[PDB]
RNA sequence: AGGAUCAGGAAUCGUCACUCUUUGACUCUUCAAAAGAGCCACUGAAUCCAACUUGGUUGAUGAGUCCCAUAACCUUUGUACCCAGUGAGAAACCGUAUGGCGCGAUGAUCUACCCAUGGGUGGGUACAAAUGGCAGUCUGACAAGU
């Protein structure tokens, strides 16, 4: 977490677990080794240090793990594709209750930042997503796929608005939450 | 002339310890919670299960010996008492001119009921005694160290 204000402040996150709220104990080595490297990353700060704000989608991980900012720590929740798939985008919404997780096999889990508790399971793309996104004010969400397909969804609605079909697969998808455009790297 | 405000009456010490009491601080701490200058990282310690080790039913641990089972409190059977004390009252002559145990204070005299001063029953008080009551002969599987 690099300060451009202070060099002093730039301080290296932690990468401990809390203690698993279930009971049962959690998988993994017990020489413990760091996350796998990250290929996405996803970050709003309307709800900040109430629960996670940052996730993450590290190296060839089905799930994908859930950070606070504020604590500068890897956070309780780690977030799943559910179509046993690595997650290969990310993205999170702007009300800090909702994170977007888009499978290598299509499925974007729609997990809460409250409980970690999933809410929708959407299928759209049958190749990989790419890039998720919600609009700014949590009403129409978009995903840009490997398949060449833009699908417009509705967030508070459940149904499929539009699906724009592009050329090439889609390798990227970045929104303008102010202007509610948003682009994409394609493979033209 | 008697009393109370601003000569009829002991109190001039360059301290050493000791003890006691007193209050205050204090690490804490119950009433009883509640608030937490918050997050990382490093490093340390401690605890608890798993683990392993050593010891253990040839007995690990747990344990009110002494407050005395060596008893207390009774209960029944053999003795000592008292409603030790009482204290002046108990029985009628004399070996060979003469001599005495012939009582007794220095002790004579006795040891709530019925029966003509013969015997005992009843209660309190004490002890000896119980193979009598009250009053029915321990656990047994983990422990401990990292």
Same mark, same amino acid.
């Given at each position: 977490?690099?300060?451009?204000?202070?060099?002093?402040? $730039?301080?290296? !996150? @932690? =990468?401990?677990?809390?203690?698993?709220?279930? #009971?049962?104990?959690? &998988?993994?080595? +017990? %020489?413990?080794?760091?996350?796998?490297?990250?290929?996405?990353?996803?970050?709003?700060?309307?709800?900040?240090?109430?629960?996670?704000?940052?996730?993450?989608?590290?190296?060839?991980?089905?799930?994908?793990?859930?950070?606070?900012?504020?604590?500068?720590?890897?956070?309780?929740?780690?977030?799943?594709?559910?179509?046993?798939?690595?997650?290969? $985008?990310?993205? !999170? @919404? =702007?009300?800090?209750?909702?994170?977007?997780? #888009?499978?290598?096999? &299509?499925?974007? +889990? %729609?997990?809460?930042?409250?409980?970690?508790?999933?809410?929708?399971?959407?299928?759209?793309?049958?190749?990989?997503?790419?890039?998720?996104?919600?609009?700014?004010?949590?009403?129409?969400?978009?995903?840009?796929?490997?398949?060449?397909?833009?699908?417009?969804?509705?967030?508070?609605?459940?149904?499929?608005?539009?699906?724009?079909?592009?050329?090439?697969?889609?390798?990227?998808?970045?929104?303008?939450?102010?202007?509610?455009?948003?682009?994409?790297?394609?493979?033209?």
């Amino acid at each position: 977490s690099f300060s451009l204000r202070k060099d002093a402040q $730039s301080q290296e !996150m @932690s =990468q401990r677990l809390h203690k698993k709220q279930d #009971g049962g104990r959690v &998988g993994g080595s +017990t %020489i413990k080794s760091k996350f796998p490297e990250i290929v996405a990353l996803a970050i709003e700060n309307a709800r900040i240090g109430e629960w996670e704000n940052i996730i993450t989608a590290h190296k060839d991980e089905k799930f994908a793990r859930t950070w606070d900012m504020r604590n500068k720590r890897v956070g309780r929740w780690t977030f799943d594709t559910t179509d046993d798939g690595f997650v290969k $985008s990310v993205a !999170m @919404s =702007q009300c800090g209750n909702f994170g977007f997780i #888009g499978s290598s096999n &299509g499925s974007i +889990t %729609i997990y809460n930042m409250q409980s970690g508790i999933l809410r929708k399971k959407y299928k759209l793309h049958k190749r990989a997503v790419t890039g998720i996104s919600l609009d700014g004010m949590n009403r129409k969400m978009v995903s840009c796929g490997l398949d060449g397909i833009v699908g417009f969804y509705d967030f508070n609605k459940s149904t499929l608005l539009g699906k724009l079909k592009l050329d090439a697969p889609i390798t990227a998808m970045v929104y303008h939450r102010s202007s509610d455009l948003f682009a994409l790297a394609l493979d033209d």
